[PDB]
Amino acid sequence: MYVRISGRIRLNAHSLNAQGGGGTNYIEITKTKVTVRTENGWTVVEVPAITGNMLKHWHFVGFVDYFKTTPYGVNLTERALRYNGTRFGQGETTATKANGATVQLNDEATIIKELADADVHGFLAPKTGRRRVSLVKASFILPTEDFIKEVEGERLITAIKHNRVDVDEKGAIGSSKEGTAQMLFSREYATGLYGFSIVLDLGLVGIPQGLPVKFEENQPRPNIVIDPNERKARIESALKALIPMLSGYIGANLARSFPVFKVEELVAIASEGPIPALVHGFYEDYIEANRSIIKNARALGFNIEVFTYNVDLGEDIEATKVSSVEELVANLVKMV
Amino acid sequence: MYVRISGRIRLNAHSLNAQGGGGTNYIEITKTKVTVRTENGWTVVEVPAITGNMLKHWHFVGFVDYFKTTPYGVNLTERALRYNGTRFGQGETTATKANGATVQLNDEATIIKELADADVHGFLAPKTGRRRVSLVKASFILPTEDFIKEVEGERLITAIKHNRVDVDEKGAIGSSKEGTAQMLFSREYATGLYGFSIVLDLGLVGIPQGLPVKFEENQPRPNIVIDPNERKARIESALKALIPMLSGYIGANLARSFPVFKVEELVAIASEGPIPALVHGFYEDYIEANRSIIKNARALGFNIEVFTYNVDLGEDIEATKVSSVEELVANLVKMV
Amino acid sequence: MYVRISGRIRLNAHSLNAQGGGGTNYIEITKTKVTVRTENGWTVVEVPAITGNMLKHWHFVGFVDYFKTTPYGVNLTERALRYNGTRFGQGETTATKANGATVQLNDEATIIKELADADVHGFLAPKTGRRRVSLVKASFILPTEDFIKEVEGERLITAIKHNRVDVDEKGAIGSSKEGTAQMLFSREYATGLYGFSIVLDLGLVGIPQGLPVKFEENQPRPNIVIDPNERKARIESALKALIPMLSGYIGANLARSFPVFKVEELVAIASEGPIPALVHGFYEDYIEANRSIIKNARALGFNIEVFTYNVDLGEDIEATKVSSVEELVANLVKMV
Amino acid sequence: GWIRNIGRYLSYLVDDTFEEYAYDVVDGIAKARTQEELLEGVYKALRLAPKLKKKAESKGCPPPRIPSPEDIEALEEKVEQLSNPKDLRKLAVSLALWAFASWNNCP
Amino acid sequence: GWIRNIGRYLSYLVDDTFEEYAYDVVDGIAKARTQEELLEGVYKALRLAPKLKKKAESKGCPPPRIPSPEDIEALEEKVEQLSNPKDLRKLAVSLALWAFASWNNCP
Amino acid sequence: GWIRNIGRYLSYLVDDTFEEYAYDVVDGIAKARTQEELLEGVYKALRLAPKLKKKAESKGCPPPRIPSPEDIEALEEKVEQLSNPKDLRKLAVSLALWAFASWNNCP
Amino acid sequence: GGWIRNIGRYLSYLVDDTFEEYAYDVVDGIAKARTQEELLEGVYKALRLAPKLKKKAESKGCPPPRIPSPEDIEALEEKVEQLSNPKDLRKLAVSLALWAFASWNNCP
Amino acid sequence: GWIRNIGRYLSYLVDDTFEEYAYDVVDGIAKARTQEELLEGVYKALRLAPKLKKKAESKGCPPPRIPSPEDIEALEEKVEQLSNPKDLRKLAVSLALWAFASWNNCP
């Protein structure tokens, strides 16, 4: 079961995915270049953004959070309990098990049947050479094009400096000459209307990549190495992992920033067969394009199911109006 | 007690979280830029705000204040008694308890066992490398969209200028050559209606982050290193810490400003397991965005229990109509 | 049945086809030198690009994906089923069919009959010398010339640093002496308005190139070693393989980058007879060149069909306006 | 160039030897979005004329230089024809670029 | 020459001592594309001049070199002929390059 | 355009060499947002004319120039056809801004 | 006129070990200096990392980096001002770009 | 004449023990009509220092030696006066010639 969700969200006072400071007193958010038409030729502007790697890691955190409560939660990597996104590292041969056992890196079927995070997000063991591509693909989160076009430059990143109080046992504040630590570190906070294009394929969950099908009697028999109930639980956990991602649990510095989050709109498509990924919501005319992407795909012979959040998508399209993301994932988990 | 609360508060005549000014005669309230639709194109406006660091520190102050009274209050860091916001220095290896004992900074299980504030707010030891994610996360305090948009200008800030008078033993004002320690000391004063969306993942208290769940025989169990009564006391103190937060004990310049405070409305959800982060109250229609986030959340299998103050939240949703803040805390602590 | 496609596709925050570093923490994006006319005389500029080899590999991946669902999916290679792009490396004489059967390499007709990938994408067997040129040609992906004219370069590239958080059982980063794997690599991300051109020479599927005709009594006829249903299914799968190119499944690092990838405009031609390829979309003046090259070609007596998306082609040309790429592939598969 | 004369007066209220430190009005003039905001900021800056007139002599300083009534005409005619936010913001920032300069006053 | 003085002043915002690390103003001045961005970045940089003046005696360092009114009142019309971003980027980078030089701010 | 005579009259009650220094009327002129209070403020400012006329000869300088009745009348049809507050307050703040300058009231 | 080595010594701190600051992008941009404007931009990008190296050198028992003197900046500015031809601009850029990779004894 | 120390470095990019096979740098340094392309080629060859050093480090045998900064200025202080290509050839070809020798690096 493959599901593609893309939409527009509003962020304010967020500082997700900063470029760090390297031990210095200035930490700034990641920025990258985008191209806009601006009715005067395609110009390139630099805007704040959060990398897809961090979004994928937060999806993994949500997945491992919602998989523990499942009775099949023993089949998990012990390192993944503390949200350590390492998989197998570089110089590793035996992977720890949440139960306390050990897993040999080879025999990818064993890896996917015993570790759940490696099943969904893939893994790499270079000591032997085993690879498994991630079944969840995350895209960048850029501010939407029309917002940049209609803001007319006028950068929206504000540098707020908030200190570090160091009260000594004598109630004194000094410098490094006495053994104290007093720095007024500054952090960059931003805002704007961003877009997300989370795409995730779950048809290969529990399916080794060395032999997806068995061909017992010349039939495309899926090669599931785990219990079907376990596969269903894994898919349900992965689908419910979108509950915290679109509720505000994405990004760094949640303790002191906790981005002011609200999903402005989104569209999601789900199917059992392979389908084109929906265009990102960063572009201004994505919605109409997505409508076509739906309208001309159902007639081709795909049983695409479409859910929208306050998105019209015209008419004559079997689209379900979800009141919130929670109702969306509730609809998705029914067809697993 | 994964408790999420968000609401609107009428912060009138405050000066919380200034910009420091480096000690000159002019100091200003920190400002950040937020996006508003205005129904004719999204525009960014710069308005006063309260950084989440300040809110988290004041939560820590309330936590230690309400944890000292509990007989289990011995396990507090020495620096925490004086409300020192620091958690661990850049190059220190040991910590001092209230009674004067010494706590090592390795095997963070014992650190969270013998320390209370570091257990519930997290810490960081650069030398040994220990870390702990904060169990209390707070968001910015921003003026709401419906208010920021309908003012149509109205700079809010007034910059009242009040200076110190100094007289010597002869009743002489003095001059600059004699110093007399006179400065004009102009300060900015703001107003408006703001929102807050602080969250508390308190269900992980007293549990080491390295091994959050132990496996006795292929079955999960929480790794409660501390006594269960100690855990209950810590949870009760953390919940009651919100009482001197919605009463006017947040920010700085309390000795002179002490904001004229009142909670206009609020909604809180306690539940037991991982639940979606409640959306911020900064947006105008958040109530609707909440009415569609808890009514359908209960359908997925979440035991969400919702308390509301001055918010209808429909009628089909079983919402407890709380009349104040501290009895909301009482309802929250009834389920310990 | 021959197909040619060209057009302009917009890319943002893509990291497709980097040099990969190999033995360093820097992941350089591939560069190539292109000739820009310019009013000051022809110059050469270094721009990011996607090699055609990797584009062809992605087309093969899409072809396998949409050919497995076909009931005739048994005629695939074991390596092809794993997306292994190698075909009959040196020193080997046998092919492992996905069914587990063994296919000899002494005859081209048998290979193309029992192996779909070798038939469609060509193959080489250095041990026995059997060769077959691929039936799909892919050109490089370059930023369009007028884009370079308008942006004056701007270096069109950013570098984003990603860490490898190595948290051990004790929660430590290490000092490169215990066995830790914590460092900080970096990735190169680019954007721009690229141009693509794909040639589908689907007229020899199921037809060996040694003896393309039979001449039973001196009249031409195709030499097909498969039943017409197999040829139809192969052609339909190849045509549908363009869907996971114009939707965003082009490039590497899809787990973290997943290029934003909106298609901007496109023109496609399709005819049974041999047709000249269209002008690649990199050139700014390719609309008029393509218009002339289709008008005159139709004037010679070629029964070509023209599909256009977001391009006018004037009014004299009888071309069909296609709303989106899946509609284009539907129209293509409608005419055999 | 018709702005340095008023810029000197603007700098008179944020420098030493005059004890004003009214950063608020200068920031309002510099950070002006609409022309009404810029007019209000300039009005507030020009409001503190009489306070600084006789205080300079009481502190042994030459009288401060009010902009001549001629330049108000030019400023008004310029702000009337400047409606776009770009040029208006450019003028507003250029008005107070040297508000914190090193003008030699009260030797 | 008219760039060394302003660069000297800008170098005071990032250096040893003078504990006020403001990389935002330097970044905005260097990365400015249009005239308005450069002007507002310069205004933001000069807004901290009273802070540097106050901090000079607070640490015993010599008083900072506040730019004279002459160089700014020349630089303003030096800016107001640049119709292409290519000639503005070089000016901005020249302005912001001196901020990271080994100046003897506090000998 | 009927804007300098009223500015002179407003300045005549704030400028030096006089005794009646009523900042209330000039302050309220700037802070005006509706027709009724603005008309009340201008009328209140004009009612100070007799005192200025009677004190003009106390110094021997030429008497202040009271705005002509046509100038006063023009304001009625100039303000009656303004409905938006943005343009209504622009004239209100311009009237107060024109009061502060550096001419000579009377030799 | 002798300042090329002075700025190359500073530039070499962005590639060598014992610093954990592998900023190859700025070195490549300076080495690929097509025109004077983005050559100056690359130099500014290299100089922006000066505080990081300056403060982290003392954190690992190493001498502070030899940040180029304002005289070096003046020399670079005057060299760029008189250069309007890419012919010598290429060799000028390569001159200070090549010193980045050298066996400097930064930490004994 | 400071050729062996750079000849070994250029041989590092072609020796079979280093399976990277970057022949473009050798051809670029060998085929160099003028100054700029020779300098660009030697810079390209020098840019692969991390590759060589921590690819040989991963192999176990001792790492390659980067050319010392002492003779780095030696190349540029002599190539500046070699305007004539014919006299440039005598070292341009030899730089690549010394890269195809044995240079036993590590067993």
Separation of alpha carbons E42 and E64, rounded Å: 17
Spatial neighbors of D70 by CB under 8 A, at least 6 apart, are none
| Helices assigned H by DSSP within B184-325 | 228-240, 286-294, 297-300
Contact A136 C255 (CB under 8 A): yes
A chain contacts of residue C166, beta-carbon cutoff 8 Å: 84, 86, 89
- Contacts of residue H20, defined as CB under 8 A and 6 or more positions apart, other chains included, come to H13, H48, H51, H55
From B129, B209, B211, residue closest to C172, measured CB to CB: B129
> How far apart, in whole angstroms, are the C-alpha atoms of residue D27 and residue B17?
19
Render B15-50 in DSSP notation, one character per residue.
--SB--GGGSSEE-B-EEEEEE-TTSS-EEEEEE-B
Distance from E84 to chain D by nearest Cα, in Å? 16
Q: Is H19 on the interface with C (CB under 8 A)?
A: no
Q: Which single residue is written with the structure tokens 């690929």?
A: G32
Helix, strand, or coil here: C123? strand
Q: d(Cα B38, Cα H13) in Å, to the nearest integer?
A: 62
Written as one letter, the residue type at F29 is I
Interatomic CA distance for residues C234 and B283, integer angstroms: 53
A24–chain G nearest CA distance, Å: 7
- Which long-range contacts link B174-181 to residues 24+ away (Cβ below 8 Å)? none
Q: What is the distance between the alpha carbons of residues B313 and B322, in angstroms, rounded to a whole number?
A: 13
Strands B220-222 and B213-215, sheet pairing: antiparallel
Judge whether C33 is closer than 8 Å to chain H, CB to CB: no
CB-based contact D39 F90, cutoff 8 Å: yes
How many residues are there in chain E? 107
Q: How far off is chain B from C174, nearest CA to CA, in Å?
A: 8
- Beta bridge mates, A191: A12
| Closest alpha carbon to B107 in C172, A78, C181, C166 | C172
B162 residue type, one letter: H
Shortest CA gap C186–chain H (Å): 15
Q: Per the CB < 8 Å rule, is E72 touching D14?
A: no
The closest CB to that of A140, out of C13, C179, C330, belongs to C13
Q: Helices in chain E by DSSP H: which ranges?
A: 4-11, 23-30, 35-47, 49-59, 69-79, 85-97
Strand segments, DSSP code E, in chain C are 2-14, 26-27, 31-36, 43-48, 94-96, 102-104, 123-125, 130-132, 136-138, 142-143, 157-163, 184-201, 262-271, 305-309, 320-321
Across the interface, whether the CB atoms of G103 and H43 are under 8 A apart is answered no
Q: What is the C-alpha separation between B152 and B171, in angstroms, rounded? A: 49
Which candidate from D21, D28, D37 shows the least CB-CB separation from B186?
A: D21
Q: Does G44 touch chain H (CB under 8 A)?
A: no
Q: How far is C241 from chain G (nearest CA, A)?
A: 37
CB proximity H44 to C under 8 Å: no
Cβ contacts of G59 on chain A, cutoff 8 Å:
23
Q: Classify each residue of B60-82 as buried b or exposed e, where b means 16 or more C-beta atoms within 10 Å of its C-beta.
A: bbbbbbbbeebebbebbbbbbee
Asked if the C-beta of E55 comes within 8 angstroms of chain B's C-beta atoms, the answer is yes
Alpha helix stretches (DSSP H) within chain F: 4-11, 23-30, 35-46, 49-56, 69-79, 85-97
Q: Report d(CA C239, CA C246) in Å as an integer.
A: 12
d(CA C114, CA C124): 16
> Which residues make beta-bridge pairs with C96?
C102
Q: Is D90 on the interface with E (CB under 8 A)?
A: yes
Q: How far is B63 from H76, CA to CA, in rounded Å?
A: 67
Which class for D83: exposed (0-12), middle (13-18), buried (19 or more C-beta within 10 A)? exposed
- Total residues belonging to chain H: 107
Distance of CA A289 to the CA centre of its chain: 23
E-chain residues within 8 Å CB-CB of D93?
36, 39-40, 43
Report CB contact under 8 Å: G98, H66: no
Resolution of this entry, Å:
3.4
Backbone CA torsion sign across G83, G88, G90, G92: negative
Q: Inspect the interface and report whether the beta carbons of G38 and C155 lie closer than 8 Å.
A: yes
D35, D66, D76: residue with CB nearest F102: D66
Cβ of D23 within 8 Å of Cβ of B26? The answer is: yes
Residue A300 in tokens: 């081709």
Question: Which SS3 state, helix, strand or coil, does residue A29 take?
Answer: strand
Q: Is C26 on the interface with G (CB under 8 A)?
A: yes
Distance separating alpha carbons of residues A239 and A234, to the nearest angstrom: 9
Chains C and G touch (3+ CB pairs under 8 A): yes
User: What does A280-304 look like in DSSP terms, one character per residue?
Assistant: PTTSTTHHHHHHHHHHHHHTTT---
Taking CB atoms and an 8 Å cutoff, what residues of chain F touch D39? 90, 93-94, 97
For residue C160, give the nearest of F77, A18, B177 by alpha carbon: A18
Query: Is residue F94 within 8 Å of residue F6, measured between CB atoms?
Result: no
Report phi then psi at A39, rounded to 5. 50, 15
Query: Which of the residues E19, E51, E52 would you substitute to probe the B interface, choosing the one with the greatest number of B C-beta atoms within 10 Å?
Result: E51
Q: Which chains touch B (3 or more CB pairs under 8 A)?
A: A, C, D, E
Q: Touching check for D50 and chain F: CB below 8 Å?
A: yes
- Quote the CA–CA distance of A83 and A121 in Å, as a whole number: 13
D103 three-class SS? coil
Of G53, G78, G79, G47, the C-alpha closest to G65 is G53
DSSP output for D22-91? -HHHHHHHHS--SHHHHHHHHHHHHHTSHHHHHHHHHTT-PPP-PPPHHHHHHHHHHHHH--SHHHHHHH
DSSP per residue, C125-138: ETTTTEEE--SEEE
Instruction: Determine phi and psi for F81, rounding to 5 degrees.
Output: -100, 10
Please give the backbone phi and psi of residue C260, each rounded to the nearest 5 degrees, phi first: -65, -50
